Amino acid sequence: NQSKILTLQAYDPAKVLVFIGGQRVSGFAADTKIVITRNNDNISVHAGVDGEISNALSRDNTGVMTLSLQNTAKWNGYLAQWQRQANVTGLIYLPVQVEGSQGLSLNTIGWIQKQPDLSYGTEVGQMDWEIGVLDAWLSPDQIQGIAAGITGLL
Amino acid sequence: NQSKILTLQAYDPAKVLVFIGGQRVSGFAADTKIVITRNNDNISVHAGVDGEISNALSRDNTGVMTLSLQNTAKWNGYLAQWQRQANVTGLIYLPVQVEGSQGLSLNTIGWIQKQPDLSYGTEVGQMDWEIGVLDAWLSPDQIQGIAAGITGLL
Amino acid sequence: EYQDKVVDVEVSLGTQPIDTVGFETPMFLAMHGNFPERIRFYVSTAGMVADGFAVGSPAYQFATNAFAGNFAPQRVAIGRMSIDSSKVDFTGTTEQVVVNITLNKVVKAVKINTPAQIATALADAVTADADLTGKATAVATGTYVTVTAVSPNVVSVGKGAGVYKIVNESSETVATVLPSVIAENHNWYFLATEARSDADIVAAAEFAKANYKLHIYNSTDVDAYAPENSAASVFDTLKSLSYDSLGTSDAGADVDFTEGSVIGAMAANDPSYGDSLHLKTMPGMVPFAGSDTQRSNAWSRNANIYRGLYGGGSYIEGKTSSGQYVDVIRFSHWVKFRMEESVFAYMKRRSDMGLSMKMSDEDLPVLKSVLMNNPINIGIRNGGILTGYDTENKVSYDPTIIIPKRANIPTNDLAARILRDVKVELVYNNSLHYVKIRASVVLDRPAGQSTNAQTPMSSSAVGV
Amino acid sequence: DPTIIIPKRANIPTNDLAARILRDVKVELVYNNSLHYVKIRASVVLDRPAGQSTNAQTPMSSSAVGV
Amino acid sequence: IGAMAANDPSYGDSLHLKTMPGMVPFAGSDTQRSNAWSRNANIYRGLYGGGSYIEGKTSSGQYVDVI
Amino acid sequence: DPTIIIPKRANIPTNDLAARILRDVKVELVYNNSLHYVKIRASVVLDRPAGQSTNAQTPMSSSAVGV
Amino acid sequence: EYQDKVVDVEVSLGTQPIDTVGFETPMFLAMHGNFPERIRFYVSTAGMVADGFAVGSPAYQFATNA
């Protein structure tokens, strides 16, 4: 057996596009751009004494989308001003979209949950904004779909 | 098979021109004039247990350009004064250009990263200034271009 | 050029688009006069009917069957032969008979309500239509009605409702026509014929082997599953000649031309996977109704049969006339075509910049990489080509490539400027066709097993 | 990529060295484009959509038959 | 001429597969091509979607490259 | 290897010394060749390939029997 | 002399070639009348049968064993 290349193209971080309200975000941090995590488990399990197993689905799809930006980036001002604008007017929701380069994507509604701490030091600082998401289901954008009707059994 | 001359002209070190801010640098060291090195690898490789291979491009193009000058050269004063001028006013960037004699070239923005140590001894001393570069991609200045559309495969 | 709206939307109700797939276009050699060209390409039955083809006509049936497969292509090639007349045979039994006939862009559906009486009534009804009489002709005889078009008019006749045959007669022979058809376009892979005489089928089979095409035919014959000693069917005829052609028995092969279903289950299947046809489902075909002995006879004659199992329909055994599996033939053709295409594409690109290839040891070896790209590697990735070490024979399956050196090339080839003796080797994989299981059941308490804990020895030591 | 070319002294005619004016400097550029018009194609379904083809093969690029 | 003018003979770069705009593919069958080759009449042929000259032969039978 | 030959003065006829023209200079060359046609021989295996011969000797060049 | 294709491939199913080895040719003095010459050289049993040798005949057995 010979080793196989898992993809034809190369994963390019610059190809990952983040659209918050219809504008592209720029000025990201060094290591990680964005992290998406679900708040709660998908399926719960109830185990009886005799061994009977029953499960119930979870309808809580809220999640948190970390966003790292350099403190010198101009987008810090946009989010800071929008925070107070929403606080005064009362409108906090805005569309959020993420395009993957060689992975999953995301397209839902979101809001600003917490403002990151600010620290000034010898080197350029970093700010990790937290953006909520109404639904944290990562959707594919590939040829997937012809095999989902094959894995099905039982 | 007969030996072939790799070039028609002769590599002349004096023909290598360095333009920092629009002025030609003079008074170089003995052995090496300039050295250009990339900070990080171009492409990373992730190898799975089963043998699957995936790669991701690197967008960090920062580099370091060593510059050797005799301690008696007048350009030591220019750089020393510019260091304090930038420190006070806050402007550190300035254009950098390198012309190769029979090799690659370079044309990007740069800045002074570290001042070399000074030592006084029996013989004339040497100073190795370090100049940063925004992008460290060495570009060609030759008939290259008609074959890049030939090596392509897969 | 001028757009009156910055944004415009066309709301299509119900319909949906389909993606563009790569495939091999089939060719159906039909006899008619709807267009002058020898061969045309259609993308939907709508275009064929717009060209004067009558609904239910042979070409229409073939196209609608081909476009309904899971691997159906997106183009169909229709050949053209001369046409002398057509027949509507009512042999058999039938309550309402409807025959769709189109004459010179005029579409009509004659109607009628013992076969001879039905044929006579239909013939009389045809003459009742003044338009048909002026431009077309009809005559009754026995159980069939013969219709002929007046010379400057084109008539197309197709099935409506009821039980009957539609047979078209033509003076042109397939052997004479195919050499002209191939001249206009060689861009097709599958070969099919409307005429179902033994001579036409044999001629098509002989032509296909010479011109590297795949031949398909449905026989609708009853001797196809006669006892093994009865070597009198076309299937047995082809065996004696060692020809290759995917033939199968059926019941509607001369009312629907079910070659379309097979092509649609074969067109968009990449040979690189070695994906046999064993159990592929095909719409349109009808299950084989014979008993076990008939199936055994059909298998002995290499006549494939469509069988229904557990509620569905399934092809079986995908065998050809010569006995070799169709999968192997397709794989061999795929390798033969694509190795050549890859090498030619590299050579042309290398000679289009100047610096054309030269016969020397310093440039020849690049053919190894050129060939290891494209087929030899795609086959391994998709599983078609086998690799690894064999434990039984103690041999390796690794693909091999050999290139001769300049010193071994005869002087004559340096004048002819052609290289020879390049060698390649491969090992083909295999699908799974049949499985046999051995079960066991226990009723009482099973007997206690042996309590030996030693590691089982390999073989007896006693040997001299 | 933008390109810039400068002639060498050996290629300058003697007359320009008297006129003291340089010529033949060349530059190239590629201009971007805005978006003016857009056209969309929508579709609506009413009944149960028909089952799609269940082919799982990687779609091949082009037909192999070519001579 | 445009596929031959700026080609340096020092490389020995034959015309075998050079593509030429403007020409139209030869439409005859195999026997016609064999006859044309026997008469040293070169033919432009289309293969695998492109167009290509063939065999670059001259009237006397010697390859044009050698001349 | 390319070769060049030049005659000596003693071999020049007296007439050429009056005509002042030299003759008989000789040069030789060997021309390279492009590649025009290629033929390949492939093979396919279906069952288990038969075990190969297990001879480990260095293959001899030619039969010794000769008189 | 004339080649209609720039590249051609003969797909042989199953069969494989074998390299050329140096060896000493054996001689089997058989009695028959299939050819006039006193001695002939064969490279495979197929050629011997093509010369009228019956399957299972002494020469055929010797060749297939060798």
PDB file of C-alpha atoms in Angstrom, chain C residues 188-374:
ATOM      1  CA  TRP C 188     -18.130   7.747 -29.658  1.00  0.00           C
ATOM      2  CA  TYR C 189     -17.493   4.522 -27.783  1.00  0.00           C
ATOM      3  CA  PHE C 190     -20.594   2.317 -27.597  1.00  0.00           C
ATOM      4  CA  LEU C 191     -22.069   0.743 -30.732  1.00  0.00           C
ATOM      5  CA  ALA C 192     -25.707  -0.264 -31.198  1.00  0.00           C
ATOM      6  CA  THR C 193     -27.771  -1.243 -34.227  1.00  0.00           C
ATOM      7  CA  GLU C 194     -31.479  -1.139 -35.005  1.00  0.00           C
ATOM      8  CA  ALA C 195     -31.497  -3.997 -37.510  1.00  0.00           C
ATOM      9  CA  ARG C 196     -31.562  -7.323 -35.670  1.00  0.00           C
ATOM     10  CA  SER C 197     -30.750  -9.782 -38.455  1.00  0.00           C
ATOM     11  CA  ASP C 198     -27.922 -12.221 -37.789  1.00  0.00           C
ATOM     12  CA  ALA C 199     -25.772 -10.828 -40.602  1.00  0.00           C
ATOM     13  CA  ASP C 200     -26.051  -7.244 -39.341  1.00  0.00           C
ATOM     14  CA  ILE C 201     -25.065  -8.270 -35.809  1.00  0.00           C
ATOM     15  CA  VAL C 202     -22.101 -10.287 -37.069  1.00  0.00           C
ATOM     16  CA  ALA C 203     -20.958  -7.381 -39.245  1.00  0.00           C
ATOM     17  CA  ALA C 204     -21.203  -4.945 -36.331  1.00  0.00           C
ATOM     18  CA  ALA C 205     -19.243  -7.326 -34.107  1.00  0.00           C
ATOM     19  CA  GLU C 206     -16.506  -7.705 -36.724  1.00  0.00           C
ATOM     20  CA  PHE C 207     -16.325  -3.931 -37.212  1.00  0.00           C
ATOM     21  CA  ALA C 208     -16.138  -3.163 -33.488  1.00  0.00           C
ATOM     22  CA  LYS C 209     -13.144  -5.427 -32.861  1.00  0.00           C
ATOM     23  CA  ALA C 210     -11.234  -3.757 -35.706  1.00  0.00           C
ATOM     24  CA  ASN C 211     -12.094  -0.171 -34.734  1.00  0.00           C
ATOM     25  CA  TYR C 212     -11.830  -0.553 -30.931  1.00  0.00           C
ATOM     26  CA  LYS C 213     -15.468  -0.099 -29.964  1.00  0.00           C
ATOM     27  CA  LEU C 214     -17.787  -1.899 -27.547  1.00  0.00           C
ATOM     28  CA  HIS C 215     -20.760  -3.694 -29.098  1.00  0.00           C
ATOM     29  CA  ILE C 216     -24.108  -4.242 -27.365  1.00  0.00           C
ATOM     30  CA  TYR C 217     -27.146  -6.150 -28.623  1.00  0.00           C
ATOM     31  CA  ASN C 218     -30.408  -7.527 -27.240  1.00  0.00           C
ATOM     32  CA  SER C 219     -31.554 -10.645 -29.062  1.00  0.00           C
ATOM     33  CA  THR C 220     -35.217 -11.200 -28.025  1.00  0.00           C
ATOM     34  CA  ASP C 221     -34.737 -14.767 -29.290  1.00  0.00           C
ATOM     35  CA  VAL C 222     -36.271 -17.835 -27.670  1.00  0.00           C
ATOM     36  CA  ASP C 223     -33.525 -20.305 -28.635  1.00  0.00           C
ATOM     37  CA  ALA C 224     -31.224 -18.266 -26.380  1.00  0.00           C
ATOM     38  CA  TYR C 225     -32.074 -20.610 -23.481  1.00  0.00           C
ATOM     39  CA  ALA C 226     -32.638 -23.813 -25.452  1.00  0.00           C
ATOM     40  CA  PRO C 227     -30.911 -26.992 -24.226  1.00  0.00           C
ATOM     41  CA  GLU C 228     -27.129 -26.792 -24.383  1.00  0.00           C
ATOM     42  CA  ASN C 229     -26.896 -29.121 -27.395  1.00  0.00           C
ATOM     43  CA  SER C 230     -28.961 -26.737 -29.575  1.00  0.00           C
ATOM     44  CA  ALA C 231     -26.146 -24.604 -30.994  1.00  0.00           C
ATOM     45  CA  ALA C 232     -28.377 -22.634 -33.343  1.00  0.00           C
ATOM     46  CA  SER C 233     -28.763 -19.133 -31.846  1.00  0.00           C
ATOM     47  CA  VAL C 234     -26.795 -15.970 -32.570  1.00  0.00           C
ATOM     48  CA  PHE C 235     -25.210 -16.220 -29.121  1.00  0.00           C
ATOM     49  CA  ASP C 236     -23.657 -19.559 -30.060  1.00  0.00           C
ATOM     50  CA  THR C 237     -22.757 -18.134 -33.469  1.00  0.00           C
ATOM     51  CA  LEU C 238     -20.607 -15.420 -31.899  1.00  0.00           C
ATOM     52  CA  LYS C 239     -18.837 -17.863 -29.568  1.00  0.00           C
ATOM     53  CA  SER C 240     -17.410 -19.817 -32.502  1.00  0.00           C
ATOM     54  CA  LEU C 241     -15.829 -16.613 -33.846  1.00  0.00           C
ATOM     55  CA  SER C 242     -14.310 -15.661 -30.458  1.00  0.00           C
ATOM     56  CA  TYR C 243     -15.801 -12.179 -30.796  1.00  0.00           C
ATOM     57  CA  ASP C 244     -16.511  -9.849 -27.877  1.00  0.00           C
ATOM     58  CA  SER C 245     -19.971  -8.343 -27.459  1.00  0.00           C
ATOM     59  CA  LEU C 246     -22.187  -7.854 -24.420  1.00  0.00           C
ATOM     60  CA  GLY C 247     -25.327  -9.721 -25.497  1.00  0.00           C
ATOM     61  CA  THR C 248     -28.342 -10.450 -23.313  1.00  0.00           C
ATOM     62  CA  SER C 249     -31.736 -12.062 -23.844  1.00  0.00           C
ATOM     63  CA  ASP C 250     -34.915 -10.109 -23.151  1.00  0.00           C
ATOM     64  CA  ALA C 251     -38.586  -9.897 -24.108  1.00  0.00           C
ATOM     65  CA  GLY C 252     -39.032  -6.206 -24.979  1.00  0.00           C
ATOM     66  CA  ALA C 253     -35.762  -5.816 -26.875  1.00  0.00           C
ATOM     67  CA  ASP C 254     -37.622  -5.279 -30.170  1.00  0.00           C
ATOM     68  CA  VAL C 255     -40.349  -2.948 -28.844  1.00  0.00           C
ATOM     69  CA  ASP C 256     -38.163  -0.792 -26.593  1.00  0.00           C
ATOM     70  CA  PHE C 257     -34.542  -1.443 -27.648  1.00  0.00           C
ATOM     71  CA  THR C 258     -33.369  -1.854 -24.063  1.00  0.00           C
ATOM     72  CA  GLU C 259     -29.727  -1.239 -24.993  1.00  0.00           C
ATOM     73  CA  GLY C 260     -30.370   2.222 -23.586  1.00  0.00           C
ATOM     74  CA  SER C 261     -30.734   0.893 -20.053  1.00  0.00           C
ATOM     75  CA  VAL C 262     -27.426  -0.987 -20.234  1.00  0.00           C
ATOM     76  CA  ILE C 263     -25.656   2.047 -21.677  1.00  0.00           C
ATOM     77  CA  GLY C 264     -27.123   4.262 -18.958  1.00  0.00           C
ATOM     78  CA  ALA C 265     -25.849   1.799 -16.363  1.00  0.00           C
ATOM     79  CA  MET C 266     -22.436   1.820 -18.085  1.00  0.00           C
ATOM     80  CA  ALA C 267     -21.817   5.252 -19.640  1.00  0.00           C
ATOM     81  CA  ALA C 268     -20.623   7.340 -16.675  1.00  0.00           C
ATOM     82  CA  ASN C 269     -18.794   4.522 -14.845  1.00  0.00           C
ATOM     83  CA  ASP C 270     -15.053   5.132 -14.644  1.00  0.00           C
ATOM     84  CA  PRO C 271     -13.148   1.918 -15.511  1.00  0.00           C
ATOM     85  CA  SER C 272     -10.354   2.867 -13.100  1.00  0.00           C
ATOM     86  CA  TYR C 273     -12.374   1.459 -10.180  1.00  0.00           C
ATOM     87  CA  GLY C 274     -12.936  -1.925 -11.813  1.00  0.00           C
ATOM     88  CA  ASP C 275     -16.633  -1.623 -10.975  1.00  0.00           C
ATOM     89  CA  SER C 276     -18.273  -4.723 -12.460  1.00  0.00           C
ATOM     90  CA  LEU C 277     -21.898  -4.797 -13.600  1.00  0.00           C
ATOM     91  CA  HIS C 278     -22.847  -7.784 -11.442  1.00  0.00           C
ATOM     92  CA  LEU C 279     -25.786  -6.375  -9.464  1.00  0.00           C
ATOM     93  CA  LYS C 280     -26.437  -2.978 -11.060  1.00  0.00           C
ATOM     94  CA  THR C 281     -30.117  -2.088 -11.296  1.00  0.00           C
ATOM     95  CA  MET C 282     -31.415  -0.860 -14.649  1.00  0.00           C
ATOM     96  CA  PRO C 283     -34.777   0.854 -15.246  1.00  0.00           C
ATOM     97  CA  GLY C 284     -36.853  -0.256 -18.200  1.00  0.00           C
ATOM     98  CA  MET C 285     -35.843  -3.910 -18.336  1.00  0.00           C
ATOM     99  CA  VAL C 286     -38.264  -6.671 -17.329  1.00  0.00           C
ATOM    100  CA  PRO C 287     -37.278  -9.651 -15.133  1.00  0.00           C
ATOM    101  CA  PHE C 288     -36.415 -12.937 -16.824  1.00  0.00           C
ATOM    102  CA  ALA C 289     -39.268 -15.403 -16.327  1.00  0.00           C
ATOM    103  CA  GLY C 290     -37.718 -18.778 -17.169  1.00  0.00           C
ATOM    104  CA  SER C 291     -37.051 -21.540 -14.667  1.00  0.00           C
ATOM    105  CA  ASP C 292     -33.766 -22.855 -13.292  1.00  0.00           C
ATOM    106  CA  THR C 293     -32.876 -25.077 -16.255  1.00  0.00           C
ATOM    107  CA  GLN C 294     -33.483 -22.228 -18.697  1.00  0.00           C
ATOM    108  CA  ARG C 295     -31.192 -19.980 -16.654  1.00  0.00           C
ATOM    109  CA  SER C 296     -28.503 -22.669 -16.645  1.00  0.00           C
ATOM    110  CA  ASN C 297     -28.755 -22.977 -20.426  1.00  0.00           C
ATOM    111  CA  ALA C 298     -28.561 -19.203 -20.858  1.00  0.00           C
ATOM    112  CA  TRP C 299     -25.464 -19.049 -18.661  1.00  0.00           C
ATOM    113  CA  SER C 300     -23.880 -21.875 -20.647  1.00  0.00           C
ATOM    114  CA  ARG C 301     -24.468 -19.846 -23.823  1.00  0.00           C
ATOM    115  CA  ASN C 302     -23.131 -16.601 -22.259  1.00  0.00           C
ATOM    116  CA  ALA C 303     -26.510 -14.859 -22.648  1.00  0.00           C
ATOM    117  CA  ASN C 304     -26.887 -12.504 -19.694  1.00  0.00           C
ATOM    118  CA  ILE C 305     -30.301 -12.332 -18.029  1.00  0.00           C
ATOM    119  CA  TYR C 306     -32.010  -9.682 -15.920  1.00  0.00           C
ATOM    120  CA  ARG C 307     -33.389 -11.275 -12.757  1.00  0.00           C
ATOM    121  CA  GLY C 308     -35.567  -9.990  -9.942  1.00  0.00           C
ATOM    122  CA  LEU C 309     -34.555 -10.794  -6.374  1.00  0.00           C
ATOM    123  CA  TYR C 310     -35.994  -9.684  -3.033  1.00  0.00           C
ATOM    124  CA  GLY C 311     -38.301  -7.202  -4.752  1.00  0.00           C
ATOM    125  CA  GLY C 312     -35.706  -5.527  -6.967  1.00  0.00           C
ATOM    126  CA  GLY C 313     -34.170  -6.143 -10.373  1.00  0.00           C
ATOM    127  CA  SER C 314     -30.524  -6.980 -10.982  1.00  0.00           C
ATOM    128  CA  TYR C 315     -28.253  -7.796 -13.905  1.00  0.00           C
ATOM    129  CA  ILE C 316     -26.110 -10.923 -13.526  1.00  0.00           C
ATOM    130  CA  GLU C 317     -22.539 -11.968 -14.223  1.00  0.00           C
ATOM    131  CA  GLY C 318     -21.778  -9.283 -16.817  1.00  0.00           C
ATOM    132  CA  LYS C 319     -20.176 -11.869 -19.115  1.00  0.00           C
ATOM    133  CA  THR C 320     -19.328 -11.325 -22.780  1.00  0.00           C
ATOM    134  CA  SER C 321     -19.542 -13.641 -25.780  1.00  0.00           C
ATOM    135  CA  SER C 322     -15.933 -14.854 -25.587  1.00  0.00           C
ATOM    136  CA  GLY C 323     -16.298 -15.647 -21.870  1.00  0.00           C
ATOM    137  CA  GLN C 324     -14.188 -12.771 -20.553  1.00  0.00           C
ATOM    138  CA  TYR C 325     -15.844 -10.361 -18.142  1.00  0.00           C
ATOM    139  CA  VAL C 326     -16.834  -7.032 -19.673  1.00  0.00           C
ATOM    140  CA  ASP C 327     -15.040  -5.269 -16.819  1.00  0.00           C
ATOM    141  CA  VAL C 328     -11.653  -6.571 -17.965  1.00  0.00           C
ATOM    142  CA  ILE C 329     -12.305  -5.485 -21.556  1.00  0.00           C
ATOM    143  CA  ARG C 330     -13.272  -1.989 -20.433  1.00  0.00           C
ATOM    144  CA  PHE C 331     -10.182  -1.732 -18.234  1.00  0.00           C
ATOM    145  CA  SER C 332      -7.909  -2.825 -21.077  1.00  0.00           C
ATOM    146  CA  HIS C 333      -9.452  -0.282 -23.448  1.00  0.00           C
ATOM    147  CA  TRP C 334      -9.141   2.443 -20.806  1.00  0.00           C
ATOM    148  CA  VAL C 335      -5.443   1.731 -20.275  1.00  0.00           C
ATOM    149  CA  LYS C 336      -4.792   1.498 -24.009  1.00  0.00           C
ATOM    150  CA  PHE C 337      -6.426   4.853 -24.716  1.00  0.00           C
ATOM    151  CA  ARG C 338      -5.128   6.890 -21.793  1.00  0.00           C
ATOM    152  CA  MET C 339      -1.491   5.778 -21.785  1.00  0.00           C
ATOM    153  CA  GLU C 340      -1.332   6.871 -25.428  1.00  0.00           C
ATOM    154  CA  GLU C 341      -3.132  10.153 -24.770  1.00  0.00           C
ATOM    155  CA  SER C 342      -0.833  11.017 -21.861  1.00  0.00           C
ATOM    156  CA  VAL C 343       2.342  10.254 -23.805  1.00  0.00           C
ATOM    157  CA  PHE C 344       1.157  12.214 -26.845  1.00  0.00           C
ATOM    158  CA  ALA C 345       0.151  15.178 -24.691  1.00  0.00           C
ATOM    159  CA  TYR C 346       3.582  15.283 -23.066  1.00  0.00           C
ATOM    160  CA  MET C 347       5.389  14.951 -26.400  1.00  0.00           C
ATOM    161  CA  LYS C 348       3.338  17.679 -28.083  1.00  0.00           C
ATOM    162  CA  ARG C 349       3.894  20.113 -25.222  1.00  0.00           C
ATOM    163  CA  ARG C 350       7.612  19.302 -25.235  1.00  0.00           C
ATOM    164  CA  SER C 351       7.905  19.914 -28.997  1.00  0.00           C
ATOM    165  CA  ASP C 352       5.689  23.021 -29.029  1.00  0.00           C
ATOM    166  CA  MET C 353       8.392  25.048 -27.247  1.00  0.00           C
ATOM    167  CA  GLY C 354      11.194  23.804 -29.420  1.00  0.00           C
ATOM    168  CA  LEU C 355      13.616  21.411 -27.756  1.00  0.00           C
ATOM    169  CA  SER C 356      11.699  18.418 -29.117  1.00  0.00           C
ATOM    170  CA  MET C 357      12.573  15.049 -27.615  1.00  0.00           C
ATOM    171  CA  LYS C 358      15.715  13.337 -28.899  1.00  0.00           C
ATOM    172  CA  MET C 359      16.729   9.669 -28.889  1.00  0.00           C
ATOM    173  CA  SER C 360      19.379   9.577 -26.178  1.00  0.00           C
ATOM    174  CA  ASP C 361      19.842   7.990 -22.771  1.00  0.00           C
ATOM    175  CA  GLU C 362      19.748  11.449 -21.173  1.00  0.00           C
ATOM    176  CA  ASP C 363      16.140  12.188 -22.185  1.00  0.00           C
ATOM    177  CA  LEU C 364      14.356   8.856 -22.670  1.00  0.00           C
ATOM    178  CA  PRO C 365      14.014   7.936 -18.963  1.00  0.00           C
ATOM    179  CA  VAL C 366      11.538  10.778 -18.346  1.00  0.00           C
ATOM    180  CA  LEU C 367       8.918   8.528 -19.940  1.00  0.00           C
ATOM    181  CA  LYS C 368       8.960   6.606 -16.661  1.00  0.00           C
ATOM    182  CA  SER C 369       7.616   9.610 -14.747  1.00  0.00           C
ATOM    183  CA  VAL C 370       5.312  10.572 -17.622  1.00  0.00           C
ATOM    184  CA  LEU C 371       3.663   7.139 -17.578  1.00  0.00           C
ATOM    185  CA  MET C 372       3.655   6.841 -13.778  1.00  0.00           C
ATOM    186  CA  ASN C 373       1.568  10.008 -13.950  1.00  0.00           C
ATOM    187  CA  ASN C 374      -1.984   9.696 -15.288  1.00  0.00           C
TER     188      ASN C 374
END
